Structure formats: C-alpha cells, structure tokens
Nucleic acid binder design. Structure first.
Ligand SMILES: C[S@@+](CC[C@H](N)C(=O)[O-])C[C@H]1O[C@@H](n2cnc3c(N)ncnc32)[C@H](O)[C@@H]1O
Ligand SMILES: [Mg+2]
Ligand SMILES: [Mg+2]
Ligand SMILES: [Mg+2]
Lengths: 54, 95, 55, 97, 140, 338
RNA sequence: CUAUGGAGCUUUAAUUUAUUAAUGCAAACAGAAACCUGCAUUAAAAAUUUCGGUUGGGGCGACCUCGGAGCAGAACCCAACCUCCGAGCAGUACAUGCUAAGACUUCACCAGUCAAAGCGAACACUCAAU
C-alpha cells in the first residue's frame, strides 16, 4: 500500500509538472520584460529631465 | 590496553576500533573517510565522491588494530547475504 | 564577519522527496530553480522550503 | 514513599546468586514520590447515622482523612470487608422479610 | 511575607542600617509596593554609577523617585559631562551636581541650572534613551 | 575585555581635554551627540526605480533636503553636483529607515549613509563628462554618490587596504550595474596615495581626498582597531604628516584649473585646518604650486536649515553633531589649483 | 629555568548545594497554628581542581592557523626566531549529476589534488589562501 501510494503520488505530480515548468518560465520571462520596460521608462524620464534642463 | 583482565586474566578488546573499523579475514582493514558528513555544502562533487568511499589501511595501522583486537574478531564468518563476502580473500597475489 | 548568504534547502516538486542545499542572498526572494531529480531521471522544479543556517 | 532507580545497569547474576554491587550502583535517581500523588477514597460501611449518609448499611466512599480519624476510631463505621457486607446483607434480608 | 522580604532585601542585600531602614520606611512608603528586582536595581545604580553613600541616599530620599526619570536625568548629565562617576579611589575630577538639585527640582529648573541646554534637546535625548533601554531589554 | 583604560575611554578623555578649549560652550552638546546614536540618510540609487523609492520614502515621511537646497540656491542669490537624491527625517525625529530591499532591476533601492558625508560630493561641483580621482575611496561612501551623479567618464578610486577595497567592490557589485564597471570607466586600485603625484600629474579634473583621521564617532563606540590604542599611538602621532602628504599628492595629481575637496570626519583644528595650511605652504616651497581656497559660506547658508555649522572656521566648513541633527562630525575645504 | 610535581592564602577562576538558615508548593492535622518529610528559590558557610606556550628585562602590548615577498640562482625540499602585506570571502551556474582505469601529494598518518573511458544531459566554475 505504501509503495502504491508513493508511485501514484509521483505520477500525479509528474502529470502536471510540465505545466508548472512552463508557467514558471513564462513568469520569469514576463518579469524580465517588465524590468526592461521599466528601464525604458527610466530612460524616457531621463530624456524628459534633459528636456527640462534644455 | 588491558593485557590481563582483573576477572579472567585474559586480554581485552578496545570497542572503539570495533565500532569504527571492519576487518577482512585476509588481514586487511576497511575504514571510512574522516569528515564524510561534515560541511558538504563547501566541498566539490569529486571531493564528496572520494570522501564517501571505503578505503583500506596500511601495514602499520593494520598491525596496530591487530594488537588492539582479540582473536574472536579475526575468525572467518559465514553470514547469509554478506555484502563483503567476496572481499575476504585475495586472488592472484604474488608476494 | 557579516553573514551575507544563507544556506537553504530545495525540495523537488515531483514529490520524490529529493532535496539539496544551496546558498542564496538573505535579502532576496524565495528561490524556485530547475534541478535534476535522480528519482525521476530528469529535471524538475525545486522550491525553497526551510532556511538551514547563515554563513 | 520515595522511589529511586539506579543510574547504572547492574550485571545479571543468574539464579541463586546475589548480584555484585559497585560504588556507582549507589547512585540513585528519584522516579516518584508517592506523597504527591492524587488522593483516593476509602470505601466503608456505616453503622449509625452520619451527616453525609444517615442509613446503616450503605457503602460510602469518603476521604481517608475523615474516615481514618472520625468514623473508624469512634466506631461510627466499619470496614467494607466481605464478611461485614455479608453480615449487613443478612440484616437487610431480615428487614425485607 | 512581602514586607519581610522587602526589609530583608534592604538590610542584607542592600546593607542598610536598621535606623536607615526605619527612616526609609517612614519617608518613602512606595518601596513596599515596588517589586524587589527593580528596587535592588535602583539602589545599586545609585550606589555604583552615581557613587552616593547610604546616609546621603537615606537623607535625600532617592528611592521615592521614578527609575525612568532618574536614568534620563543622570545619563543626560553624564553625557553632557556635568556628572562624573566616582572612580575606584572615590575621587572625582569635577564637582558633582547635588542629588537634591538633580532630582527634586523641575525639569525646567534642572535644564536651566545643571544641563544648561534646550528642552527640545532634552526631549530628543529622552526618546533616544527610551529606544536604547528597550533595545537593551530585548537583547538581555 | 581590556585590562585598564579602554580605547573608547582614552578617546573620550583626549576629546574632552582638547575640545574643552577648542570649542568653548559647544562641547557639552557635541559630546552628547557623539555619545548618542547618529541619524541616517537614505541615498537613492538613481540606476534603480528612483521615482518609486522616492514615493516610498515620502510615504515614510522623509523629505528631499537636496531638492530643498536646490530650490534655495536661487533664493539666496559653480552651483553643485546634480542628479542626487537623499532623504532625511525632520529635525529632531528619531525614526529610522528600514533596511534596503532589492528592486526588480536586481540592484538595491537605497544606501543608508550619514548625510554629512554627502556634503563634500555636493561641494565638489561635478560637471557632465568629467574625470574624477578619489583618494582613500574605500569603503566607497562617497564614490557611490559620485557614481549616482554619473557625471564622470573616468573615475579612479584608490585605497590602501585590500579588505576595504574588497568591501568597496562588493558595494559596486550590489549597486552599480555591471555594464558601467566592465570598461575602464571605474578603476579601483590598492596603492599608496602619495604616489599619484608622480604617477599621474596634472591629469584629473575633480579630486576628492578623505585622508585617514581619528573619526570621533567611530572612536567613541567601536572598540576594535581604534586610533587611541597603545599600539597605535605612533600612528596617531604620525597621522598629520600622512594627511598633509596625501593632500599634497592629490593637489599634484589634479590639473591646473582643477578642483580638490579635502574632507575629514573629525573636529580637531590640528587635523582640519593646519593640514591644509601645511599642504599649501609645502606646495609653495618645494614644488611652487599655487592654490586658492574657495569660499563656502554660500554653501553653508543653504544647508543651515537641516545642518549645524561652526561659524569660526578659517578655511573650510565644518558640520558639528547636534541632538536635533545628529549628522557629523564632518569638515571639508574646496580649493582650485592655479 | 623545567616539571602537563605539591602545598598555604585570596577571589567577580571552573563545577556543586551535599550542609545550615529563610521562604513557597506538596504531604498531615486542626480550623487556626506549630513539629517532621519531599520537591523548588535565595543566600551563608564551604568542598574538588587548575595555572597552555612564544616574545630573555619586567610592565605594556603582540604573537600561535593558512597564502605571498625578501629565503637556498637551474628537478623537489630546505633560513626556525625574525621583517612585512593579506585570508578565515565574494561572485556566476543549478547535471556545482552518477560511476570508473591510471597517477600526484607539503617530507609520517589524518587529510588534500588531477583525471581517460562509461551512463545520463547540452549542442569536473572564477579566485593564492578564504
Ligand atoms: C576615513 S576612510 C574614508 C572612507 C570613504 N572615502 C568615505 O568617505 O566614506 C580612509 C581610508 O583610506 C585608507 N587609507 C589610509 N591611508 C591611505 C593612504 N596613504 N593612501 C590611500 N588610502 C589610505 C584607510 O584604509 C582608510 O580606511
Ligand atoms: Mg610538557
Ligand atoms: Mg574527586
Ligand atoms: Mg606523501
């Protein structure tokens, strides 16, 4: 019984493991994209500050 | 080391070596590596791999343990399903 | 001798019970790595569970 | 009553031979003191009228501190021995007759 | 038993004469209400960190005041440099402000005469000392 | 523990014996402030989410005294080094900033440093596309401000001690993104500071020299490696010579028409003003180099709102510790080499 | 000067309250109390044991592990005391997985280091010590 429960738990976890992996990778990619978008926003704000200076 | 016990007049055995070392009937002594469970997060995989092995002892240490253990531990055993059964005897050894 | 990093334990999300220790910065989020699991003979996610010690 | 246990194991002596005691066997540890245990109730059979129970022949469980000092010493009650309870059931039968 | 313990603390732990204990009981009655540990801490603070003796403390009624305000004013003066803790020899490089002036007068008069500093500075020091004391208690 | 006369007590006794006549009636307040905890200022990492951390600090009720000074510059009337943000609490406040947390960019949001240490950077008067030298840079409290300003194409930071060099490099890794430091834009070195007058003479435009000195604030609290130990008495005695030599080396390194900011975290005139005067006299005698100390009264008047200054300094400007504003102690002198 | 030889004395040296005294709880009575017993907290008075090496004054300090330079010129080793600078970290991966020929080694041992092939993946991490 213990062996069967272990095996079925492993199978259940591995059934949804690929979805978890792809969701985590998507989350990391979206975090990187948001960081780069914030970099672009900071560059725009620096350009606005330069415009104010000039 | 007790060369003559006070209740039997016979040599005693140190139990530290018994708990720490394994003796093969051929005369070799097998031990562990000091520190194979200590601070594994700062050790390389190769270092851990060679730390978690079983190694032999040299002639001086073998003689020391031979003196420190009695003849009961030097007998030949016939345990059923013994992992070290094939290692009790030397093969193709010259001098 | 300030302790900038801590040793933490990562367990597999596959339920195999496999786990390993890795060091991370204290001032950081909880880690979710992708590590090889010998039980399932492939790579699976590992999430931080418990902080072990500071180093 | 204080109860103690030896800290060190005493080697077996066998049958018909007393064990050999050592100086380290004199070291004891306190397992339990009985005087700190919860109290019990003494069960007895009455002979005269009492404030709690006023009928002769009723088995009553009362605190030892009272049963041992007031009921038994003055003869107001008797022990719940099997002989006593038989003798009281005899008079109960006589009354019911 | 509480009164017996308090008087035994005064006579044995604090080493006060019987007449001094009687005078303390007559003059500062809040000592009985006060717990033992804080009372001993106050007495030893006065004895060591202030260097005041038994006749002086029993004459000035030091034990009746709040340990918090005692700490605040004493530490403020010590950090100012107006108060110098007596050394092993009992000598002090500077004259010390009197206990009556440091405690019995108002905060305004205390600042005007001894501290010679601003009330805002005193309040800021009070906040800092409260933070330091709570941190010390947490550490202990 | 130590046997007798601990270093902290020795430092306190020396400071009493000297400043009791050096300052007059300010020594009580100065001593109380030095013995009490110092107020911290939050320097915003401009490379990170500066707007978001500014909003966070303003919700924490911190004010931008740098921006207030920028506003007051024209109100009172070389300007100052631009593109800097530092937040401090109101006068007399005891609230402390929470420990810094990393942002989405991977770099920490802000650095907790004494606000008085930012004054030399502002007085240095940085300009875009400049060249900066930083003697005794490590651990890098002022070099971080220089890089946040970001007006230097080449910054050469030097400090003798490899341990503090490593600490400065760790700070740079934590704050400055790797692409700025990958090139020769930042050059951290560990060599004697007296060599730069021959290694690179008339080379650098802005130079900041913060000579080693008996820091009173650290001396009165830290009990490890104090200048007032018996083993270090020789170093304490020889300290003014090293200070004047380092200032002379920095003046040699800077180019004619260049700017030198000499700063020290102490209150003693002997190590604040006499060092500068000895340096200028040595320049006049040995190397025939002329320098002009600028007037910083205009600089002082702007920051008098949030800082306490001593108005009896012959050459530079000195910020003294106070209970309302526990920043300091600090001293700095600005000089142009002609 | 040496002894991992003693002893006397002192104490905020380490380990204890066995003992005494005072409290509290329990037990036992009275109805409240006292004596005794057990278990805890305080003191008092005590009991056992000890002085790690270097720097010759002596204090005052510093030193004891590892790395580098002055240090033995050309395979290796080799100057102890000494003079000086550092280290007792940090950073990037998350196969920094698993097994397995043959070798090096700080002059012993303990430790420490390199690594063919093979399984499994992708198209034996940087750093002198740490
Ligand atoms: C007082 S700290 C200045 C820290 C930093 N500049 C700041 O303002 O936050 C000066 C440091 O310079 C280093 N230093 C001392 N003498 C030096 C010298 N002669 N040349 C270069 N650096 C030196 C010391 O290690 C000391 O920690
Ligand atoms: Mg010896
Ligand atoms: Mg003994
Ligand atoms: Mg070898």
């Amino acid at each position: 019984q213990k062996r069967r429960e272990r095996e079925q738990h492993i199978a259940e976890c591995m059934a949804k493991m690929p979805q978890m992996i792809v969701n985590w990778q998507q989350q990391q990619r979206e975090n990187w994209e948001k960081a780069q978008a914030d970099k672009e926003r900071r560059a725009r704000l620096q350009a606005e500050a330069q415009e104010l200076l000039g | 080391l007790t060369y003559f016990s006070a209740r039997k007049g016979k040599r005693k055995t140190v139990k530290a070596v018994i708990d720490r070392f394994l003796r093969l009937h051929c005369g070799l002594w097998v031990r562990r590596k000091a520190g194979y469970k200590k601070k594994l997060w700062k050790k390389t995989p190769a270092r851990k791999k060679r730390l978690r092995e079983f190694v032999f002892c040299n002639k001086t240490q073998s003689k020391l343990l031979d003196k420190m253990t009695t003849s009961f531990w030097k007998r030949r055993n016939w345990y059923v399903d013994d992992p070290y059964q094939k290692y009790h005897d030397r093969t193709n050894l010259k001098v | 001798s300030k302790s900038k990093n801590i040793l933490v334990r990562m367990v597999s999300e596959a339920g195999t019970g496999f786990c390993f220790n890795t060091k991370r910065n204290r001032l950081r989020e909880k880690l979710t790595l992708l590590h090889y699991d010998p039980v399932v003979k492939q790579r699976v996610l590992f999430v931080e569970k418990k902080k072990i010690r500071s180093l | 009553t204080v109860i103690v246990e030896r800290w060190w194991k005493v080697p077996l002596a066998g049958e018909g031979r007393k064990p050999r005691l050592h100086r380290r066997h004199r070291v004891y540890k306190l397992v339990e003191d009985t005087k700190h245990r919860p109290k019990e109730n003494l069960e007895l059979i009455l002979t005269q009228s009492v404030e709690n129970v006023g009928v002769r022949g009723d088995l009553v469980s009362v605190k030892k501190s009272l049963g041992r000092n007031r009921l038994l010493p003055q003869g107001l009650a008797v022990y719940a021995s099997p002989e006593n309870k038989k003798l009281f059931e005899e008079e109960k039968l006589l009354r019911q007759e | 038993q509480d009164i017996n313990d308090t008087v035994r603390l005064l006579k044995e732990k604090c080493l006060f004469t019987v007449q001094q204990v009687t005078k303390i009981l007559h003059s500062c009655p809040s000592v009985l209400r006060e717990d033992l540990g804080q009372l001993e801490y106050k007495f030893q603070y006065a004895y060591f960190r202030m260097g005041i003796k038994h006749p002086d403390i029993v004459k000035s009624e030091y034990l009746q005041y709040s340990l918090t305000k005692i700490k605040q004013r004493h530490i403020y003066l010590e950090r100012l440099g107006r108060y110098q803790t007596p050394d092993k020899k009992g000598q002090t490089q500077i004259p010390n402000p009197l206990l009556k002036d440091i405690l019995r007068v108002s905060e305004a008069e205390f600042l005007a005469r001894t501290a010679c500093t601003s009330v805002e500075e005193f309040q800021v020091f009070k906040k800092l000392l409260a933070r330091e004391e709570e941190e010390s208690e947490s550490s202990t | 523990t130590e046997p007798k006369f601990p270093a902290v007590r020795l430092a306190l006794q020396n400071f009493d014996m000297t400043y009791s006549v050096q300052f007059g009636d300010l020594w009580p307040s100065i001593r109380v402030s030095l013995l009490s905890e110092q107020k911290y200022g939050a320097l915003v990492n401009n490379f990170a989410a500066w707007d978001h951390v500014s909003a966070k600090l303003e919700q924490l009720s911190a004010k931008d005294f740098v921006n207030e000074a920028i506003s007051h510059w024209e109100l009172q009337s070389w300007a100052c080094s631009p593109n800097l943000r530092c937040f401090t609490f109101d006068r007399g406040d005891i609230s402390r900033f929470p420990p810094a947390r990393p942002g989405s960019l991977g770099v920490m949001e802000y650095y907790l440093m004494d606000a008085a240490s930012l004054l030399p950077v502002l007085a240095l008067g940085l300009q875009p596309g400049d060249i900066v030298l930083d003697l005794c840079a490590a651990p890098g409290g002022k070099t971080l401000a220089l890089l946040q300003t970001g007006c230097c194409r080449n910054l050469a930071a030097n400090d003798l001690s490899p341990s503090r060099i490593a600490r400065l490099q760790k700070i740079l890794h934590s704050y400055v993104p790797e692409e700025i430091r990958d090139g020769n834009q930042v050059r951290v070195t560990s060599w004697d500071g007296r060599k730069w007058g021959e290694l690179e003479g008339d080379t650098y435009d802005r130079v900041l020299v913060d000579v080693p000195c008996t820091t009173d604030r650290h001396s009165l609290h830290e009990e490890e490696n104090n200048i007032f130990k018996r083993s270090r008495k020789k170093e304490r005695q020889i300290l003014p010579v090293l200070q004047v030599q380092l200032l002379a080396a920095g003046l040699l390194a800077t180019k004619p028409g260049g700017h030198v900011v000499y700063s020290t975290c102490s209150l003693s005139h002997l190590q604040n003003e006499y060092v500068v005067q000895g340096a200028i006299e040595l320049l006049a005698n040995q190397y025939s180099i002329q320098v002009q100390v600028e007037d910083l009264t205009h600089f002082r008047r702007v920051f008098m709102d949030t800082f306490c200054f001593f108005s009896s300094c012959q050459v530079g400007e000195l910020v003294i510790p106070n209970l309302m504003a526990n920043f300091g102690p600090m001293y700095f002198c600005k000089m142009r080499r002609l």
